Amino acid sequence: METLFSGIQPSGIPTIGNYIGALKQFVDVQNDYDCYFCIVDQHAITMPQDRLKLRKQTRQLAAIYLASGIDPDKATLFIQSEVPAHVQAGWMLTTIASVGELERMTQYEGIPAGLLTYPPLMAADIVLYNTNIVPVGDDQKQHIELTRNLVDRFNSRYNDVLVKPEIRMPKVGGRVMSLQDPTRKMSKSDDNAKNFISLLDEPNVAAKKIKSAVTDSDGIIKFDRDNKPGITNLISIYAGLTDMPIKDIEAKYEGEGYGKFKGDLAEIVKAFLVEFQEKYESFYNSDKLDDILDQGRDKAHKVSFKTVKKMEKAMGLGRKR
Amino acid sequence: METLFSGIQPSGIPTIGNYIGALKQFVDVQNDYDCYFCIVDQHAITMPQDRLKLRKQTRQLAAIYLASGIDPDKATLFIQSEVPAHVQAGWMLTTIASVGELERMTQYEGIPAGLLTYPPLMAADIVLYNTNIVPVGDDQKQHIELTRNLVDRFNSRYNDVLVKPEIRMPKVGGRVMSLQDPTRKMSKSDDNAKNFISLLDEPNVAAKKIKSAVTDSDGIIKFDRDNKPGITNLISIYAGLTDMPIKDIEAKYEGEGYGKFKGDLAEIVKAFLVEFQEKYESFYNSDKLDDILDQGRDKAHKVSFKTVKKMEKAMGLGRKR
Numbered sequence: 328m329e330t331l332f333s334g335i336q337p338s339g340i341p342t343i344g345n346y347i348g349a350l351k352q353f354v355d356v357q358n359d360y361d362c363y364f365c366i367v368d369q370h371a372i373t374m375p376q377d378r379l380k381l382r383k384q385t386r387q388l389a390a391i392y393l394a395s396g397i398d399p400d401k402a403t404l405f406i407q408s409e410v411p412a413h414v415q416a417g418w419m420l421t422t423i424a425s426v427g428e429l430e431r432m433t434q435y436e437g438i439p440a441g442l443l444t445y446p447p448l449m450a451a452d453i454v455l456y457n458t459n460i461v462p463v464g465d466d467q468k469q470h471i472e473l474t475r476n477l478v479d480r481f482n483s484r485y486n487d488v489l490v491k492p493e494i495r496m497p498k499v500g501g502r503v504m505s506l507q508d509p510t511r512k513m514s515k516s517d518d519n520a521k522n523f524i525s526l527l528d529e530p531n532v533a534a535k536k537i538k539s540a541v542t543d544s545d546g547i548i549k550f551d552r553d554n555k556p557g558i559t560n561l562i563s564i565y566a567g568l569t570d571m572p573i574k575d576i577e578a579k580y581e582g583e584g585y586g587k588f589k590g591d592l593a594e595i596v597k598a599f600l601v602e603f604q605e606k607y608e609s610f611y612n613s614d615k616l617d618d619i620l621d622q623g624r625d626k627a628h629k630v631s632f633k634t635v636k637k638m639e640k641a642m643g644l645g646r647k648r
Numbered sequence: 649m650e651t652l653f654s655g656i657q658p659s660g661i662p663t664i665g666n667y668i669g670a671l672k673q674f675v676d677v678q679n680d681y682d683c684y685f686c687i688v689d690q691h692a693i694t695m696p697q698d699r700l701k702l703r704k705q706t707r708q709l710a711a712i713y714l715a716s717g718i719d720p721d722k723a724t725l726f727i728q729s730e731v732p733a734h735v736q737a738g739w740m741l742t743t744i745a746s747v748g749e750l751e752r753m754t755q756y757e758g759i760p761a762g763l764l765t766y767p768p769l770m771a772a773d774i775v776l777y778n779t780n781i782v783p784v785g786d787d788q789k790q791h792i793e794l795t796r797n798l799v800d801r802f803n804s805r806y807n808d809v810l811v812k813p814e815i816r817m818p819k820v821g822g823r824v825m826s827l828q829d830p831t832r833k834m835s836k837s838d839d840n841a842k843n844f845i846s847l848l849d850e851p852n853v854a855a856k857k858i859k860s861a862v863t864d865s866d867g868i869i870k871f872d873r874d875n876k877p878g879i880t881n882l883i884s885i886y887a888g889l890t891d892m893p894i895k896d897i898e899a900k901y902e903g904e905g906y907g908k909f910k911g912d913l914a915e916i917v918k919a920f921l922v923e924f925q926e927k928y929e930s931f932y933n934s935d936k937l938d939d940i941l942d943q944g945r946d947k948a949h950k951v952s953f954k955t956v957k958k959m960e961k962a963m964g965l966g967r968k969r
């Protein structure tokens with residue numbers, strides 16, 4: 328089984344576009360890949376963070392992942408700071424990185440040093456679990472290139488212990504776009520909140536967002552990205568939440584116009600969110616969430632401890648015992 | 649009781665000058681201060697290190713410290729990489745440091761990034777134990793200034809949990825100088841090996857070093873740094889190893905010349921090293937050294953765990969449990 332590692336920032340709610348694009352996909356591929364979902368609280372404090380909200384946001388992301396169907400027995404869901412191996416391996420790889428390498432990543436009151444020194448810690452996050460694949464976007468290509476180079480450097484200078492990962496998402500979800508700007512990806516931090524549907528949006532608010540999506544006044548329900556990106560995006564969301572094949576959506580709405588389809592889809596979005604948020608609340612407000620995160624932490628520790636031990640031995644840190 | 653923290657680099661043997669200047673002093677002040685002697689193996693890999701020798705050098709320094717009389721019940725002697733709190737707190741303080749701050753420390757194949765990012769890890773090493781005093785030299789003033797500023801910054805932004813240290817050596821030992829250049833401090837890395845007496849020099853070699861020290865051909869045994877730095881340095885070494893007051897050395901050698909005094913002192917240096925190295929061997933080659941380092945590691949962990957827990961809570965890392 329190939330090992331997958333996804334680092335999750337605890338600084339904002341995934342949208343329905345995030346869920347159709349990755350989360351729902353992870354819920355499937357966790358059966359066929361050894362999956363690591365790391366809530367990277369130590370990467371989050373490289374950026375401005377409010378101390379009193381950060382713990383909450385970390386609990387929210389774990390709750391969202393679990394409510395999506397991320398399964399704590401099949402996968403390893405854990406918080407980064409709770410597994411010391413991350414800053415242990417991250418310091419080790421920082422020593423073999425170069426200032427220039429780190430500086431070129433920042434190009435692709437003072438400037439907080441975490442924004443400069445996080446890339447070796449990201450590399451450590453991945454290789455600690457002998458990761459084969461990382462499902463990241465093109466904005467992280469430099470980070471994986473640095474990771475592979477640090478793995479080559481480490482193995483060549485000390486001895487082969489670390490695994491080079493590849494960027495790879497085993498099952499790419501459909502692309503969901505901004506509801507009032509269908510050429511851009513949907514983003515949780517849009518200034519126009521009608522552009523995204525958050526997984527924690529009020530369900531009624533989210534149906535209104537479907538009704539407010541920018542489309543032609545009417546038309547056929549047909550998939551056509553280039554000419555009708557507005558209705559097409561809506562059809563992609565319909566597909567993502569129902570699992571209806573797109574051609575099967577076209578058949579169901581043959582002879583129907585936008586009013587019927589948008590009304591139906593808004594009810595689908597509403598219903599998905601009512602079900603998702605009830606699962607989300609029951610995870611977020613339960614004592615067992617702390618047990619689940621403890622188990623995840625323990626599983627990540629048992630694997631990365633061996634990795635960090637091999638690294639320390641290879642570099643001559645610590646003691647032979 | 650005030651808490652003291654000394655970071656020990658595992659990259660070369662202390663000399664008799666190091667022992668008279670600090671080690672013998674620590675053996676006394678460990679009764680009246682809560683003393684932390686940290687073998688900083690993670691700072692050592694910021695610099696070129698051979699993986700196969702580094703573990704040895706770390707065991708050597710622990711053996712040297714114990715042979716000096718550093719007492720593992722009175723003090724805390726431990727290896728830095730064995731206590732995860734150091735890279736945990738070190739990452740936390742790196743996030744609030746600035747690139748400029750780190751860059752200005754480096755002024756006072758590529759340039760290894762550890763040489764840039766170690767100062768917050770040094771700051772972490774100290775404050776983890778609520779250190780009051782650090783016995784360091786003027787070459788570390790910038791490091792302690794950064795440490796105090798990071799402590800102010802941390803306490804002000806998150807909440808008061810960390811203690812500002814001062815540079816202070818409770819009992820300054822005598823200054824020992826190069827045996828063939830008595831204006832410079834004695835250094836373990838001199839290119840002229842007759843300048844230093846290593847604690848692991850062959851005892852016979854070390855007496856010859858006393859006999860080879862650069863002095864006048866003859867003279868009175870009198871302390872006078874400005875006019876007779878050569879014989880004066882030798883008298884300071886005689887004092888350091890015998891505990892004879894300098895005026896009492898002058899009395900014993902009234903009417904004597906350099907030949908008698910140097911011959912005596914060489915026998916004293918030889919005898920000190922025979923006793924020190926027998927203690928050094930028995931620590932270095934015993935199984936109980938690993939027990940002593942385990943106990944030291946455990947003591948350092950029990951204290952710095954609380955400190956790192958307060959820092960994580962103050963920054964909002966991890967979980968409330």
Ligand SMILES: N[C@@H](Cc1c[nH]c2ccccc12)C(=O)O
Binds near residue numbers: 332
């Ligand atoms: N750097 C990623 C988060 C992250 C940290 N470590 C990772 C390892 C793999 C993938 C992602 C990550 C981000 O900014 O979102």
Ligand SMILES: N[C@@H](Cc1c[nH]c2ccccc12)C(=O)O
Binds near residue numbers: 688
């Ligand atoms: N930087 C010190 C070693 C060190 C690391 N942490 C410390 C804390 C206190 C004193 C010294 C240290 C040196 O170069 O020698």
